[PDB]
Amino acid sequence: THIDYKDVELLKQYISENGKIVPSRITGTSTKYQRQLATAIKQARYLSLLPYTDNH
Amino acid sequence: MLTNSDREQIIAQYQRGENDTGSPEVQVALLSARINDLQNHFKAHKADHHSRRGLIRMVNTRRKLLDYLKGKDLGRYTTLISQLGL
Amino acid sequence: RHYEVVLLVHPDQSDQVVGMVERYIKLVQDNNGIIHRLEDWGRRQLAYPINKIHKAHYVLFNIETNGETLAELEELFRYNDAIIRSLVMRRDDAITEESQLA
Amino acid sequence: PIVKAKPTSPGRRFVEKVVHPHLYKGRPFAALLESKSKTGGRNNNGRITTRHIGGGHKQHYRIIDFKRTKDNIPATVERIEYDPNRTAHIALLKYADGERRYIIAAKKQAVGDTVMSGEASPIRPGNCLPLKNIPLGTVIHNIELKIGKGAQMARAAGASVQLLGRDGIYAILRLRSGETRRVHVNCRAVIGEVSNTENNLKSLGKAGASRWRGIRPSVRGVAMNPVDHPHGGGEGRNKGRHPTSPWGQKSKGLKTRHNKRTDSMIIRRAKK
RNA sequence: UUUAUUAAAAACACAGCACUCUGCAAACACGAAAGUGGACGUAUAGGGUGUGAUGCCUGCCCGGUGCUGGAAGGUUAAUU
RNA sequence: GAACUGCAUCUGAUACUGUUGAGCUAGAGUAUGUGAGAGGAAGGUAGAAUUCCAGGUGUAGCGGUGAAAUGCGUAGAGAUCUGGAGGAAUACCGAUGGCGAAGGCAGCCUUCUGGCAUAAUACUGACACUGAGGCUCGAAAGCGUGGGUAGCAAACAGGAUUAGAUACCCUGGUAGUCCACGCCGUAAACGAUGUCUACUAGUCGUUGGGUCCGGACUUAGUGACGCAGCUAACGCAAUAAGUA
To answer: Where is the Large ribosomal subunit protein uL2 RNA-binding domain (chain D) (predicted)?
Structure first.
């Protein structure tokens, strides 16, 4: 429906245990919402609500 | 850029009939305002070639419209370029 | 133009965060600015250590203002030295409901 | 900027002058002026102690406020002037009390804006602050070395210093020489880069232009006889020896630095 | 510009270029030192050296002798 | 006799072309609302990783290859941990996905700015298509001036291989790659397919909209197939190399 970078709990299940964005061929999401997912995840990473990688 | 308010100001000043917004005069006046407004942007970003392409396109369209007016009503073309200073 | 700005302040300097915030609220409201939302998320465990610290104080506030006041706020965030991070975003609407994080 | 001369004369073919239309065309503020006569590079013994100095135009000394101790009194930039004594421009400051001073003009400093000196001053080009009230990473100039002595470093046209960090009572500076140094944090610096950044872009063009600035011609050592220079002598062109000064001091890499008292104020140098 | 008085030149200088030194009580120079010049300048500055507008450019060699950096080892003064 | 395909001047015709007057909306444009996008320009910033520097632990190797050797290392390397400097690129997302006239364009944020797609209404009333000369833009390399310089790396040096090895492989390594402002004007700059318009079986994907009842339809792109037609053949085939 809609997506934001503050939805950390929602963004946790689209990011892998190593911190990588899970691809659309796996999650099944549409291209538009995958694009919004990616930009929100990068913004959350900058805000340090999510990790870039699992070894900082 | 131009806003809706000043775009409607230009349209109301160069109205040919009631709420026409499609005559050569109103089109050329809107193009002239937009070009004069974008000159400021291009004085700042002169390496902007992609936006300058669109600016050149609106210059070409304004020239075509002015040629069409010159062929259509000569006095109308002369008066319009007299207001717009072209 | 509406702006959603999130501030990351040092945990040691969290005692002055209220004055920190009200300074920017007063600056915005002075110049015909509207504070459409303001919340303090509190101390939060950072996903990665910023500047050799592992917790930080998060403060979000969505406002509406002009370019000149935005530049003033940006310079204030940059030279505050207590705000260890900032994120300024441009929003089309005005956001008022409480965020899911608070 | 730089303007090329048309090659109307062979002496004009390579003149590239620095031109600043915004410099004052009038005369300097006469109260801040002193008479200043040439030395010819001669000391109180009458001996040439610095060669190649002689002639040139008469010029007054402008009294520059390098210290900037009129703290917390705003000053307005009345005008920006050319100074014959230095490569940088000088800003005439007019304080709220009416007192006028000359300072080094920053690159981003214009006529009308207000400069401030002291500790509670904005970080804007032209303001003078102690180094502890200056945030890391800003470009500064006119650095003090002793507290209260006045600006000594980074004063030439285009000068800038990087404030890298702080390690106690010392501020860590990177100089244009490529030297990382520490300076007491209670010393002052001025925000911004020094004006006239295209000083080293100019071309004198002819020998007379160098003579106008008080520079006498320079005779190579190998062009002399051995009684004059270590490089003198030879039938035809010859060098024959490692390069040296006319006093026998190597000129191709030999370091000449004695100061053992200041050795601990220097962090490092750059190697290129 | 130059060999006043047998040499005016292709010699010197030159704008330009490079290397190198110099963080300021600068390096460097005069001086026995005080005191000076550099400079009431501050690395876009100042000193030394070479080369010598400009155009196109400037290959290989660090063995020798210098210069710069390093200190594991050998040798090594007064002294004790 | 015919012909001399011609020229000139009168007369007639008005379907088409030309020149004109008026009208029209279907081509082309305008105003208004939504939408997507690595479109462009200027700043700022983040996180990994490399290199360098300074330290703690630690000790005899590291590195490299098909093997080696050059090289680095007991003056303490490599490995490991902690600080510092700096430059460049932006993993994952990522996709016959997107945007751009082409060349091209990927972290994130702000500012300035172009085009496009879309639903309806209103408006102008053929304002169009193409385009010699011309002008603009135009990968990479290269050039000029001024900065920068981590990695990579022409040249260059050494080590191998080899009959030789001015190479391929290895170890280093400078211009360059990066920035600013300008030149250059070329690429297998390619879809080896000029641009624009109309029409001509169909099937299955995908991107951005839209309208209906998870599908149905309709649009503008972007792909894979496949008739008729075309082609020397390969093949193209509504994104034609078909019919004009």
So the answer is: 41-117
